[PDB]
């Protein structure tokens, strides 16, 4: 609280590390459904159903332009990609399974990088 400071983790490397993680995501062979925004005029229903679209290129743009206040907000957007995917795609569809794979891939890198 006021004048009662918690020790807080060193965050100086967070931008670099998130960029590294995002690069690994981008180059994953199953990244293809998520590299660019869902084409709202190619994919019937997407605009109405998915309230907050997100994709890797948008995350990359926000990361490169200082639009994430902290690593938690970065993780929010990454997870949003896979949450959207799970909302819209069947689990065993190519895109659906890609989403599950990419989520697992992200969460391990996340834990390995930041959680001691
Ligand atoms: C992640 C996702 N969620 C719902 C529908 C489709 C997709 N991926 C598509 C893959 C390439 C072209 S696209 O059709 O615009 C987007």
Write up this protein.
The PDB classes it as transcription. The chain is mainly α. It has a single domain (1-116), classed as Bromodomain-like (Histone Acetyltransferase, Chain A, Up-down Bundle). The chain is 57% helix and 0% strand. It has five helices and no strands. The protein has helices spanning 14-27, 46-49, 56-64, 71-88, 94-114. Helix 1 runs antiparallel to helix 3 (56-64). The longest helix has 21 residues, at 94-114. It is elongated and about 55 Å long. The relative contact order is 0.17. It binds ligand 6RR.
Task: Classify the helix fraction into a percent range.
Answer: 55-70%
CATH superfamily: Bromodomain-like
Number of domains: 1
Beta-strand content estimate:
under 5%
- Please, how many helices? 5
CATH architecture: Up-down Bundle
CATH topology: Histone Acetyltransferase, Chain A
Bound molecules: the ligand Cc1ncccc1N[C@@H]1CCCS(=O)(=O)C1
Separation, N- and C-terminal Cα atoms: 25 Å
- Helix/strand-derived class? mainly alpha
Largest sheet: none
Give the overall form: elongated
Supply Rg.
Answer: 16 Å
Give the helices and strands as they follow along the chain.
HHHHH
Level-1 CATH class name: Mainly Alpha
As an assembly, this protein is monomer
The number of E-state strands comes to 0
PDB class: transcription
Keywords: four helical bundle, transcription
Assembly: monomeric
Entry title: Crystal Structure of BAZ2B bromodomain in complex with 3-amino-2-methylpyridine derivative 2
Please specify the SSE layout and strand pairing.
Elements lengths: L13 H14 L18 H4 L6 H9 L6 H18 L5 H21 L2
The structure holds ligand 6RR.
Ligand 6RR binds next to helix 4.
Protein name: Bromodomain adjacent to zinc finger domain protein 2B
Family: Belongs to the WAL family.
Subcellular location: Nucleus
């Amino acid at each position: 609280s006021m004048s009662v400071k918690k020790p807080k983790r060193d965050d100086s490397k967070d931008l670099a590390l998130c960029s590294m993680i995002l690069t690994e995501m981008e180059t994953h062979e199953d990244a293809w459904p998520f590299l660019l925004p869902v084409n709202l005029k190619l994919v019937p229903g997407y605009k109405k159903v998915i309230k907050k679209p997100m994709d890797f290129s948008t995350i990359r743009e926000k990361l490169s332009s200082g639009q994430y206040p902290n690593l938690e907000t970065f993780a929010l957007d990454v997870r949003l990609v896979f949450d959207n995917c799970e909302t819209f795609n069947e689990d065993d569809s190519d895109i659906g399974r890609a989403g599950h794979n990419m989520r697992k891939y992200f969460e391990k890198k996340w834990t390995d990088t930041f959680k001691v």
